[PDB]
Design a protein around this ligand. Structure first.
Ligand SMILES: CSC[C@H]1O[C@@H](n2cnc3c(N)ncnc32)[C@H](O)[C@@H]1O
Length: 332
RNA sequence: GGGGCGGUAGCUCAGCCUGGGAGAGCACCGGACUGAAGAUCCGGGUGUCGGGGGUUCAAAUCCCCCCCGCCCC
């Protein structure tokens, strides 16, 4: 926290060089006079290193909203070490906190609010469980509500995390499959949830896509999503309500199939039966099993009488030594 | 044509009032971690601030023009 001096016709080069040294303090604004210009600096030693005229002076604090605050920066090392990563969905700020941190948590909510001032609700985060794959959350601050529209990849998505499942992080995957699609194709997505996958797909390609859901409330929300992104989508989507295993025999075949399988569930055979060109099957695999997992996929392809090449990518970290992964049936 | 707003990383966005650090979260990539975990830990910015001009020693920030998306005549 300090500073330096420079003639008005020279100030720029001083700024750029002092920025090369990184000594230029940024948490304070700089005073300008017709005579000279005065800049703040972090360490005066390196300032006399370059010999630039350096007078210790009082320069004004920058507005808070202009300073590069950070979650690490805004918290003590202990409470930061305890707290888990921050995930924002609409205006809901979701964060893992242990109890010991929960006692000292008001500092936490202060830090979150500082980092983002539009987050109207803040909730402690638990684990996924149950048929509907919902996540456990008990609000720590704000309006006692867990439903919002959430902008992602040019798409709007309403959610009530209390009654439905959604995870923003796999948007990358949701984008990645989207550009892998081709226009005019026919794709089926079981275990849709709301429609993050076929919405983000429909936005980017002109495609008919059918979705399957048991969670009736997730069907309600998906129905709501269809209007907003119906104005916004090139493609068209059909939402069928029911169990994947009844619907899949009773529905025709599709070019592509994308199965975000619930954990502990096997739908590889059933999905491979309906897909014509490619299938994307998501499962949870331990690192050693990945290759073996590929073998498994291949085995099913042989039973299906389908000659196809398969590859597998590590979609995300599920647990210690365990990743959520995806397989890409490429049928000939 | 007119005006009201928006165009910053891959997504969602701060920053602009009042000129001087390209940032946040997640994404993405590489590494690590044995019981439950749609996690967690370590490292990395991947950028034509829509474009051009003007002003100033200096523009993401102030001015004009052009392009593109929502809303009003
Ligand atoms: C990762 S989200 C998995 C989604 O699939 C839905 N789901 C789980 N099992 C089935 C099933 N048999 N049929 C249709 N949807 C399902 C759940 O409601 C959840 O939202």
């Amino acid at each position: 926290m300090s500073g330096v001096k420079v003639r008005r016709e020279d100030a720029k080069k001083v700024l750029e060089l002092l920025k090369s040294v990184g000594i230029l303090d940024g948490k304070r604004k700089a005073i300008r006079d017709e005579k000279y210009v005065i800049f703040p600096v972090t360490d005066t030693n390196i300032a006399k290193s370059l010999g630039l005229e350096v007078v210790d002076v009082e320069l004004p604090m920058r507005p808070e909203r202009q300073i590069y605050k950070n979650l690490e920066d805004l918290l003590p090392r202990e409470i930061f070490k305890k707290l888990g990563r921050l995930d924002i969905v609409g205006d809901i700020a979701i964060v893992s906190i242990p109890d010991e941190i929960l006692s000292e948590r008001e500092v936490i909510v202060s830090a979150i609010r500082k980092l983002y001032p539009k987050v109207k609700v803040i909730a402690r985060r638990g684990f996924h469980s149950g048929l509907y794959r919902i996540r456990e959350l008990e609000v720590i601050w704000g309006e006692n509500r867990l439903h919002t529209i959430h902008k992602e990849n040019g798409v709007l998505i309403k959610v009530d995390l209390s009654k439905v499942f959604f995870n923003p992080r796999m948007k990358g995957e949701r984008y990645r499959i989207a550009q892998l699609v081709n226009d005019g194709e026919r794709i089926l997505v079981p275990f849709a949830g709301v429609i993050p996958y076929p919405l983000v797909i429909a936005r980017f390609k002109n495609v008919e896509v059918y979705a399957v859901e048991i969670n009736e409330f997730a069907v309600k929300l998906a129905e709501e999503n269809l209007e907003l992104n119906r104005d916004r989508l090139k493609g068209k989507i059909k939402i069928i309500h029911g169990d994947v295993f009844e619907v899949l025999p009773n529905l025709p075949n599709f070019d592509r199939v994308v199965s975000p399988t619930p954990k502990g569930v096997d739908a590889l055979s059933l999905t491979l039966s309906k897909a014509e060109k490619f299938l994307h099957y998501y499962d949870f695999v331990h690192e050693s099993e990945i290759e073996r997992f590929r073998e498994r996929v291949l085995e099913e392809c042989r039973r299906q009488g389908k000659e196809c090449r398969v590859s597998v990518r590590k979609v995300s970290d599920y647990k210690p030594h365990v990743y959520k992964v995806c397989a890409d049936v490429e049928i000939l």
